[model samples]
Target: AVKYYTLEEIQKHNNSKSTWLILHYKVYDLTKFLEEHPGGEAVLREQAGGDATANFEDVGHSTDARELSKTFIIGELHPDDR
Candidate 1:
């Protein structure tokens, strides 16, 4: 079964120890990608533990990029948290 994460819970991971980003109602852990990001790790860090949907879309990620991002998905945002 898919796990559900709340906004409150997700907010606590905004650090180097654990980085979570809410995108399209799903939860993704980009901690490992921190240093691998092409743009910069700081960009990912800044959006940690919060919704990055807007910024993600604005940057116009390519199909491969979007597809690759899903590999980091760990769960979905709790319906109530939306």
Candidate 2:
């Protein structure tokens, strides 16, 4: 089953050593790509506990982008693993 987490919960999870993947309409697995990320994790950390829609919009187009971010989720780490 899918679960909807509050921004706080998401941030706490993100701070842990376990890896995660943030999948929204425009953003893909940002957490997984953190190491290879050009802007660094600071940007990703700043976006935590808030909507990243604006940042995503500024990044440009994703041909396959969906209307709602929830619908565009590809995959995520299992909660238990975290």
Candidate 3:
């Protein structure tokens, strides 16, 4: 089953050790992708532990990129926090 996370709890993972990004109400753990991100780690690090849907969309990511993002999904933002 999928997990649920609150924005408060999600924000605590902003560090390099456990980066998390919220997109479309879903939470994605990007810690492992730090080194794999072609845009560079800093850009990903900049949005850690917070909602990055806007930036992600503004970049006009391709369908393949969106499909690939599913691999990183760990949970969704808790209903109470939404």
Candidate 4:
């Protein structure tokens, strides 16, 4: 199951300096918005995985807003079973 954490909860734990919602699935680090994103690295890096729903709602919209929900496999945490 995917986990959701509030900004406060995430900051409190501080596992990752990134304040974005990290969506973990299939033991993979599928940080989808790391490529050719127009919002600059700062915003993209901030919201790497998961949905930036709350953020988008507050921060207004971007041309690449549609791409926010897209998912891509950046790397893997563990090797897949052969």
Candidate 5:
């Protein structure tokens, strides 16, 4: 199994300061990484509790971004969006 966090799991824990973001249908706890976001916490917070596939794709996240994601992987989305 992929052992992923479902869509609603992270939403329950979302807030402006402590955020959870989904990227490409993969759920992540972005709380710690929000400050590390190149675009700043606001941008990251805006995407909190939601899938950031389109937003991330527009920025063209790199292989480095993928690696960073692994560090904070909470789980995967159901039915996978890839």
Candidate 6:
């Protein structure tokens, strides 16, 4: 089952060691994946600890990008945001 997290809780992991972001209501701990990010770590850093779905969609991520991002997903939005 998926874990649940609040935006407040996700913000705590904003640093390089534990970056996390919300996309499509799902939380992704992107720290490990940052190095491999296509645009460079700064792009991901811009989205760190915040919802990036809109920006992600704006960039038109490929099907493979969508699939790969799921690998790091750790949870879903808290009920208030659902």
Measured by TM-score, the strongest candidate is: 1
How accurate locally is residue 46 in candidate 5, as Cα lDDT from 0 to 100?
76
Error of 2 at 27 (Å): 10
Give candidate 1's TM-score.
Answer: 0.96
Candidate 6 overall Cα lDDT vs. reference?
Answer: 0.89
Scanning candidate 5 in windows of ten residues, the lowest lDDT window is 73-82
Residue 8's lDDT in candidate 2:
41
Per-model C-alpha lDDT, please? 0.93, 0.48, 0.92, 0.41, 0.76, 0.89
Q: Candidate order by TM-score, highest to lowest?
A: 1, 3, 6, 5, 2, 4
Task: State residue 3's C-alpha deviation in candidate 5, in Å.
Answer: 3.6
* Model 5, CA-based lDDT: 0.76
Residue pairs that clash (backbone atoms under 3 angstroms), model 6: none
Clashes of each: 0, 0, 0, 0, 4, 0
Q: Compose the digit string of candidate 1's lDDT tens values, residues 1-82.
A: 9999999999999976999999999999999998889889999999999999999999999999989998999999999988
Top candidate, metric lDDT = 1
Candidate 3 is scored at a TM of 0.94
The residue-by-residue lDDT of candidate 5 on 1-82, one tens digit each, is: 5676666666775775568788766778888887787878888877788888898889888898778778887777777444
Better of 1 and 5 by TM-score: 1
The residue pairs in collision within model 2 are none
Predictions: Cα RMSD each: 0.6, 7.2, 0.9, 9.4, 2.6, 1.0
Ranking by lDDT: 1, 3, 6, 5, 2, 4
Residues 1-82, model 2: lDDT tens digits: 5555444444454553533334442223344555655557777666654456667668864655444334435344344433
Model 1 lDDT, residue 65, Cα? 93
Candidate 6 to truth, TM: 0.93
Tell me which residue pairs clash in candidate 4: none
Q: Least accurate stretch of 10 residues (summed lDDT) in model 4?
A: 73-82
Score candidate 4 by lDDT.
0.41
Q: What does the lDDT read for residue 15 in candidate 1?
A: 72
**What is the per-residue lDDT of model 6 for residues 7-71, given as tens digits with 9 covering 90 to 100?**
88998888857899999999999898888888799988888988999999998999998988889
